[PDB]
Amino acid sequence: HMERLMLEPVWEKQNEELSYTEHIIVLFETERSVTDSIASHMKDARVITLNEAVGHIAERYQCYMQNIFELLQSKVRKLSAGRIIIQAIVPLEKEKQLFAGVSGLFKTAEIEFSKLTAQVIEIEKPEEMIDLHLKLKDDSRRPFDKQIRYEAGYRFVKGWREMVDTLHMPWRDEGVYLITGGAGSLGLLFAKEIANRTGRSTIVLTGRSVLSEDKENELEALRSIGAEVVYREADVSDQHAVRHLLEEIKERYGTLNGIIHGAGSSKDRFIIHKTNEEFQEVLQPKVSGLLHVDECSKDFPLDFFIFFSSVSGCLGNAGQADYAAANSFMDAFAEYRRSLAASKKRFGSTISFNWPLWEEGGMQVGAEDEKRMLKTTGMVPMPTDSGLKAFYQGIVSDKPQVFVMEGQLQKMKQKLL
Template identity: 40%
Template sequence: MPLMLPFAVEELEVFGKCTSGMWVYARNSTGSRSGDKIVKRDIDLCDEHGRVCVRLKGLSFREAEADRNPNPGATFPETLESFMLEPVWKPQAVHTEGESLGYARHLVILCGMTGFSSRDTAKRPGGMQFVQLELSQPDIAERFHACADQVFEMIRDLLTEKPQERVLLQVVVPSQGDQQLFAGLTGLLQSAELEHARLIGQTIILDTDIKFEELVAILEENKISREKRIRYQKGQRFGLSWNELDAKEGDVPVPWKDEGVYLISGGTGGLGFIFAHDILRQTKRSTLVLVGRSALSPDKRTRIQELSDAGAKVVYKQVDVAMEDATHALIGEILRDYGKLDGILHSAGVIKDNYLVNKTTEEMQEVLAPKVRGLVNLDEATKELPLDFFILFSSLASTAGSAGQADYAMANAFMDAYATYRNSLIKTLYRHGHTLSIHWPYWKEGGMKVDAETEKMTLQKYGITAMQASTGISALYRGLASGKSEVLVMEGELTRIRQHLLSEAMEQVIPPTAVSEIKESSSTLVETELDTGNLTDKVLIALKLEVSKLLKIQSGAIDVDLEFNQYGFDSIT
């Protein structure tokens, strides 16, 4: 069934207040049939007693996109390329010509910043409301869980209030030691902003010896900033950007070796099996220890047997790596049975999709456990071993946030920060084996997947398609060989991907006042832009700005190559 996009409604009637649980009664409007080019439906929203609270009449739908490809089987381009980026902190000044967006509330959460007295924070300079979290747990995983609990509950309470005006939430974390891992909260903040446009979140990373007056000045100047992650080091301000890595394959070494012993957490998941197959294909007499929380299903037992039949040593251990004692026992057992452990691929993960206003603390903790507690347990249990590598399977969600997956985005952002932290310990010989956190997109086989229609729309709009297994394996080789702590990888049409990322980057450097002016009136910017370029470019610029104003989305997110109907416009509008 094709994906249908609503674009118009004839009549809306409200009879009463909606409840948290509703029933929907939908039917075709009079004279409309399912096979029509434009389908109209009447929809009643009813409470649990069957009373109609809201009625929509003549809600019009059309196919989200027309198949302009004469060959239905050739949906995707024949040539796809991979694209790899690394995060880089670059000196970046605040746009001094900007002004505050006029926040109704300004909340500042101090995580691990212990150098400020309650007498200072109680002054509420500039209307700032400070919350200083008490985090006394000796273990960083416990501290992060406790910090995430408190920030999550504050954000959930904020969203439950349904603020009608802008709220600025700045989370301040230290840049030193394991306290820097609190920067993983950025995944939560960005996801919350996607779920509620009036909530603006920033993660600000600071030196711990900063004075309170300096802190206030930094918070105040960043009220006009659109960056989500900001860092100050010795008084200099840095913004996070992404640099493209060299795409040349060259002679990238295979990280696996003959007679190696490798542990794959989440080993019976889709990605676990993909990399297990690759290790066995590339090596001789290797041993794989696949780890998971659950007992093996008949299908997974068969797949493991197939790996063993290929001549490899493959064992499954039912262990929850979020349990400290069980994880240490697992590592001890591996050393007793095989004498060594050469590398770890940490791909364990749990998803409990739910919007923040409906999500429970228990759900969030369950999602955090394998990627936070599990990662710390594995690292602590192997800290004295001469590992070749420690690879963490992260997600694009940690970079941009994900509505309905705030806990998942936060858990992956913690792993990203942990990769940098662990690599800093290697320099002082407290750890061995390079750490890489790799942001995976959707995969065609294994990992997170999307349906065919969504994949097609993603390709058309952004140039990104679901990653092929061969591309993902090659990307892991390249990422590990690069020596970077963190890489992001995508596959698709590189020209379109670069264009989209460039437009997004341009959006990030436009001062908030300019964005506000676009939303209120695009005339001034249109007149400035129209002084350059040919007539077609001028029309496209004007149209993008007008659509941006009407739909209240960033102009950089508007793809001029898409049909108008994909943005909900018909021939009349």
């Protein structure tokens, strides 16, 4: 009586159809010209220019997310008082595409702040367009437009097109798979699955902690299947640790056949209470961690590189501003990696899965909230085969991003379409 619903993001043409106490626009390393023109033309809105951080793209993202994050916190009393609009301007460019991830943060902010409208606006070459101000003004007049795209005289909005036997599989009986966050409850599930399917497989599980007894005990059974499993106890935030891990991989083993990036964790708190430290701490493994992995395994002939993202990344979720922006970054990264592969620079197909609450994933367990989330969302704790089925179905479709939901169909579709 419950079914996997399964969705796939689309840029559509969709322009079919109150007043703001404040108007804020944030430009992500946009052109000087763009900045000046906009301020001059829009002097009834505050304009913030992020150009300032130095680092790899992930470093800059983490930094700018914290700036957005500290911006909300401050304006918190206002949001209580009256309505506000923030618009983020993200230029589609070499790496600046990834800033579009700020959308995870904006969706969470909207849930936590009743009277906020937050839009992310991705622009192919905004400076060149001097029709810009009317659009922003016009976009401001359709609050319900949360992600908006301007490229090639085109105005797109993001939404969700639905996707519709025994399943094909990516496994090589011999050869190497790693799962960062591998000793977590989901990384173990996928470990077993590989174990069942693989025969003579090598599975490198990684995380920060020293293994507890039960984990090793849980681990030992997988050794029973005849697969060889090694826990590498590394921090994906530490670029050097990642390097070593990959090299040992290389020196130790022939090659890498596959990567799941499962590292990360959620720490629920409302934007108003959250520390910067906690905020950065949940961004790290999914943002810098992911970049570091990608770039250290660039020269490997992978069959796949799959990110374990979350339904939070694409819907936002109360108390998960950081988890959502981290997860949105990974989604944005999936497309960015594919383009790189087309350049031939990266090997293997890239997918990001937006997972719902797993039935027997650790991290969260639904309990009483389970019921609100069913009542709030129509979603249920997703059973493991249903998940594995969706996992295999997601691969064969070959899209950079697959959003998976389990629950009652009509409620789900009604909320999302």
